[PDB]
Amino acid sequence: YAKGDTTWIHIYQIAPVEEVDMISILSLKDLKMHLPHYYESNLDFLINRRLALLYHLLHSEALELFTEKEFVIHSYTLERSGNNQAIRSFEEEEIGKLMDFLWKLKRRDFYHAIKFIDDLLKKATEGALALIDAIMNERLEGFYTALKLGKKAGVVSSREIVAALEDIIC
DNA sequence: TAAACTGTTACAACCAGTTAAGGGTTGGGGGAAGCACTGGGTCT
């Protein structure tokens, strides 16, 4: 995600812990998605880097219980503001917790979850920032405000979405 | 010259009737969501 002059790239590599197999290897190969250039108009609502990261992680995959062995993720980021490249994040949890939240949200449905997230990103930008503030610096009430903007966005707000959110709440 | 004896301490009905317990009108507008500073390679 690049904004005019600044350019951000976040690579999150997957590593094993005990053992893997070719099924796991090919599953990780299938995890590779989100082709380089997907920018036609979405940037008009992407604005914040975290929001764009969440939107792009929406189209990614979040299933790892298939391989019979669970995985771990290490994420590193690179920035380029004014043609200056360096590292500002080598081991940060926000990708991991965002990925876990996405996995636990869309487990109860993918069609309604996709519709909800897409609608809030498109028109309920306040709700999108509210959700990212509920994930970044985790505070549960922010989720509610996002859902509030959902009614401002005409979101269907299916039964299973709030159930998945409550399961995330624990 | 004596200093209240006694039945009696209310009965009975009844102990809110109805009507509605918000009507409406609006549920963040609107801007921004890092500005630089720190450049990594490959060559001479």
Looking at residue A137, the DSSP 8-state letter turns out to be T
CA distances from A33 to A116, A133, A152 (A): 21, 26, 32
A78 touches strand B (CB under 7 A): no
> Residue A90 and residue A86: Cα distance in Å, rounded?
11
Q: Which nucleotide is nearest to A152 (CA to C1')?
A: B27
Q: Is the CB of A89 under 7 A from strand B?
A: no
Give the contacts of A147 (CB within 8 A, at least 6 positions apart): A127, A157, A162
Nucleotide closest in space to A81 (CA vs C1'): B36
**Quick one: tokens of A121?**
């990103």
A 10 A CB-CB count for A156 gives 12
Whole-angstrom CA distances from A102 to A58, A83, A107, A113, A152 are 7, 33, 8, 9, 22
Q: What CA–CA distances, in Å, run from A156 to A21, A72, A111, A162?
A: 41, 34, 11, 11
**Could you tell me the distance in Å between the CA of residue A153 and the C1' of nucleotide B28?**
15
The H-or-E segment that residue A72 falls in is: strand A72-80
Q: List % helix, strand, coil for chain A (3-state, nearest 5).
A: 50, 15, 35
Alpha-carbon separation of residue A151 from A37, A112, A120, A137 (angstroms): 32, 14, 10, 24
A123 contact to strand B (CB, 7 A limit): no
Neighbours of A152 (CB within 10 A): 12
Nearest partner of A73 among A151, A130, A133, A10, judged by Cα? A10
User: CA-CA distances (angstroms) from residue A43 to A2, A3, A37, A79, A113?
Assistant: 9, 9, 12, 18, 21
Q: How was this structure determined?
A: cryo-EM
Q: Which amino acid, one-letter code, is at A123? A: K
**Amino acid, single-letter form, for residue A8:** W
Give, in Å, how far the C1' of B2 lies from the CA of A116: 109
Task: Confirm if A72 and A94 have CB atoms less than 8 A apart.
Answer: no
Query: Which structure tokens are listed for A98?
Result: 């965002």
